[PDB]
């Protein structure tokens, strides 16, 4: 009962924290002219110690569209905003459960936020064209925890719907 809900809540909280850490720094690694890390906003070298915003969008129209999407991180920022909205919806549905159908829309928004985060990871992997950062693996692990939390949330929702259907008869 409450154990699965608390596990889903701490999984959503850990996924939001790892998404924030993926937004922050150390997302990728690229050897410049010496190694240098990047966190999709600015690059920092391994002289040594200086940091600057190296997310310059200039140096068919599909290349300009892909460069515009890769600039300023349109997909993962909106994905993190949708994850925060899903966490707020799960917190509003945890206490005073009046309507028994908002959890389905919250889970649908949570799965769509996970799919958008995976799509943004695909965009950031495509725009990379030599190693990888740790925040990329942290964002992948947060995507795994988000998928498992969505499965647990829809499992609790179908269990609550089956309990309501059994209590209605």
């Amino acid at each position: 009962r409450g154990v699965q809900m608390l596990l889903t809540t701490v999984g959503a909280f850990a996924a939001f924290s790892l998404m924030t850490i993926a937004v922050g720094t150390d997302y990728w690694l690229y050897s410049r002219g010496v190694m240098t890390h990047s966190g999709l906003w600015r690059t920092c070298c391994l002289f040594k110690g200086l940091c600057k915003q190296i997310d310059h969008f200039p140096e068919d129209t599909a290349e300009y569209f892909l460069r515009a999407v890769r600039a300023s991180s349109i997909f993962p920022i909106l994905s993190v905003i949708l994850l925060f909205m899903g966490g707020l919806c799960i917190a509003a549905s945890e206490f005073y459960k009046t309507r028994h159908n908002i959890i389905l829309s919250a889970g649908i928004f949570f799965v769509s936020a996970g799919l958008s985060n995976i799509i943004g990871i695909i965009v950031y992997i495509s725009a990379n064209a030599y190693s990888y950062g740790w925040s990329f693996y942290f964002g992948a692990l947060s995507f795994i925890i988000a998928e498992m939390v969505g499965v647990l949330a829809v499992h609790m929702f179908i269990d609550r719907h089956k309990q309501l259907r059994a209590t209605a008869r």
Binding site: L115, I118, I125, A140, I144, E147, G150
Partner: protein, 51 residues
């Protein structure tokens, strides 16, 4: 001089490459080592969609 006893000429010296083929690392060669992770992520995502 006498008659030549050993004939010779100009030849080519190379590094003599061997069959230096790795094992499990040779399997994940042709596509990538990073696209497969996105493939598995889309796999578990589509399974989440189905469930």
């Amino acid at each position: 001089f006498s008659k030549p006893f050993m004939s010779l000429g100009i030849s080519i010296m190379i590094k003599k490459p061997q069959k230096s083929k790795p094992g499990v690392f040779s399997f994940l060669d042709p596509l990538a080592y990073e696209i497969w992770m996105c493939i598995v992520f889309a796999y578990i995502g589509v399974s989440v969609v189905l469930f």
